[PDB]
Amino acid sequence: LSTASVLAFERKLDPSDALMSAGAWAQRDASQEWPAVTVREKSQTVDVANLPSDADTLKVRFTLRVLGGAGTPSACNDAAYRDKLLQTVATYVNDQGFAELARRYAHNLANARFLWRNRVGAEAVEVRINHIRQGEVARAWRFDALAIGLRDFKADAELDALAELIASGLSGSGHVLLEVVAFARIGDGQEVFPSQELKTLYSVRDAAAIHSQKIGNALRTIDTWYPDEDGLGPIAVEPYGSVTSQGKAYRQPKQKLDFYTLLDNWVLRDEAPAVEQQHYVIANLIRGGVFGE
Amino acid sequence: MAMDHYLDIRLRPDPEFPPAQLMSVLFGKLHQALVAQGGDRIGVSFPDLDESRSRLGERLRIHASADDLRALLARPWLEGLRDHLQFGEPAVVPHPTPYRQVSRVQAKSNPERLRRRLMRRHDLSEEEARKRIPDTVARALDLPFVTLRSQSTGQHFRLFIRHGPLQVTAEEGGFTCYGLSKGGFVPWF
């Protein structure tokens, strides 16, 4: 009974890139064929574009699905360690469902935390969501991120409905495919924001877009469990995970807020930890990633 | 001064950025009520800065008027920044007190505009620009600045500060006309 060599766990909640296009005020009932954002140049070379002097609502356009199936590691070696991991995951599946994680991901999809700097500037951050199994609409949703807070865990009835439909997509017996269309009212003659390469911007075919790993780390912003000062609320979830723009280490290995102590006591020693630590375990197993040295 | 009630609004926290986003939110709140709301003593200072490197601040100890401190209490234009931003309430203060002032005002600490004027008017040559254009063109020191978003450079920027020396006397006045101080209230006690 020991550790397996290489642990592969693929990225559930697998995102895609975020396109940008510009529309105007009170002209947004037909947000289907708006003109996109082209790459301009002004005078290092700062080739950062702006919105035009007429259109102001930046339609941010991206989608998301759920792979599912976190009960099996994508690479393992052992037989008895795998049987222990399978019966422990089956113990969780018989214990409780995906309601809490779906509501926390709804808290991520309720505010505008996925826009890291594009949130400031906009006036009424409206989140238009359709329902897709084929190329039509089945159910629609409209939000506003100024009536919905940023740090506070609140789950309204509409957020509970959308999180319940996402959880129905999450349980592994039904497929959902929900996109997000946001309106960043940046202005008439103000900056567009794609992602930056290693200025070194990013672009797509006859348009501009934003990377997908930033969305994939923004939507997993759950971590309120770092012991120093939780007046900042949710931050990014990784093993030894924190924010890298401040410069401070969260979820220390000196305490028991690490994923690895939890996994060792939770699989090997049968010293099973509590419910919210299992929520952190299944959160950073549902983000995907490499595991094992 | 016959009143013992002077407060302000500090910076609000959030996880979607570093403190440059909080500085931009404070600049928006200043443009709504303090800096772009007219008046002299409408700014944002902080006594959490060191004199060795020109730090920005780590706490909020404001000192301003009543309308600019009571207009940012229940306004609906602070979504997100109001998820962590808050304050206490007013009360009485002590009878005696000094008049100390420290802030940051808009000074001329850029060698680009004067050099552009000397290029549009003087038309300096190589040795003439090295001799007549003196060695006082690198004009920049460590001052208190945060990531200011604007269409003057590509990414966020910085900024300097400047104030005056005060004492334990009595006086009152205003700050600069951009959302700073020039002898106004700062964090002290």
- The DSSP result for B86-155, as a single string, is ---------S---B-----------HHHHHHHHHHTT---HHHHHHTS-S------------B--TTSSS
Please provide the distance, in angstroms rounded to a whole number, between the alpha carbons at the two ends of chain B. Answer: 18
- Cβ neighbours of residue A267 under 8 Å, at least 6 residues apart? A81, A84, A85, A88
Backbone φ and ψ of B60, nearest 5°:
-130, 110
**Do A150 and B154 make contact, defined as CB atoms within 8 angstroms?**
no
Could you tell me the two tokens for A14?
């697998």
Contact check, Cβ <8 Å, A117/B17: yes
- Which residues in A177-189 are b (16+ Cβ under 10 Å) and which e? ebebbbbbbbbee
Q: In what order do the strands lie in the sheet with A209-210?
A: A141-142, A127-129, A180-185, A57-62, A18-23, A209-210
Inter-chain contact B151–A151, Cβ cutoff 8 Å? no
Residue B83, chain A, CB below 8 Å: the answer is yes
* Residues after which chain B is discontinuous, using a C–N cutoff of 2.5 Å: none
| B 7-36 residues with CB < 8 A to A | 13-18, 21, 24-25, 28
* Burial readout A251-286 (b: 16 or more C-beta within 10 A, e: otherwise): beeeeebbbeebbeebbeeeeeeeeebbbbbbbbbb
Please report the resolution in angstroms: 3.6
Written as six digits, the tokens of A195 are 């992602």
Q: What is the Cα–Cα distance from B51 to B34, expressed in whole angstroms?
A: 26
Kind plus residue range of the DSSP H or E element containing B68:
helix B67-70
Query: Nearest residue of B to residue A125 by CA position?
Result: B79
Known catalytic residue at B95: no
Method: cryo-EM
At B131, the amino acid letter reads K
Place of tokens 């401070």: A248
Task: Show me where the domains of chain A are located.
Answer: 1-10+70-97+222-293, 11-69+98-221
Chain B CB contacts of A119 under 8 Å are 16, 80
Residue B3 C-alpha, separation from nearest chain A C-alpha, in angstroms: 33
Provide the pairing of β-strand A57-62 with A141-142.
unpaired
Task: For residue A149, list chain B residues with Cβ-Cβ distance below 8 A.
Answer: 79-80, 82-83
Kindly determine whether residue B15 and residue A149, on different chains, have CB atoms separated by under 8 Å: no
- The pair of three-digit structure tokens given for residue B39, joined into one six-digit string: 């008046």
Q: Do B15 and A233 touch (CB under 8 A)?
A: yes
Q: Which amino acid appears at position B116 of this protein? A: R
Query: Which residues span the domain enclosing B10?
Result: 1-189
Q: Are B56 and B145 in contact (CB under 8 A)?
A: yes
CA A73 to CA A94: how far, in whole Å?
Answer: 19
Can you spell out the DSSP letters for chain A? ----S-EEE--SS-B--EEEEEE-TT--TTTTS--B-----B---B---B--SS--EEEEEE-BB-----SS-SB---SHHHHHHHHHHHHHHHH--SHHHHHHHHHHHHSS-SSSSTTTT-SS--EEE---SSSS-S--EE--SSSS-SSS----HHHHHHHHHHHHHHSSSS--B--EEEEEE--SS-B----B----B--BTTB-EE-SHHHHHHTT--B---SS-TTS--B--STT---TTTT---S-TTTT-SHHHHHIIIIIS-----HHHHHHHHHHHHS-EEE--
Q: Residue B46 is which amino acid?
A: F
CATH number of the domain at B147, please. Answer: 3.30.70.2540
Contact (CB, 8 A) for A40 and A107: no
Q: Please indicate if any CB of chain A lies within 8 Å of the CB of B152.
A: no
Domain count along chain B:
1
| Contact state of B83 with A46 under an 8 Å Cβ cutoff | no
Token pair 């290489």: residue:
A6
- Active-site residue identified among B5, B31, B84, B122: B31
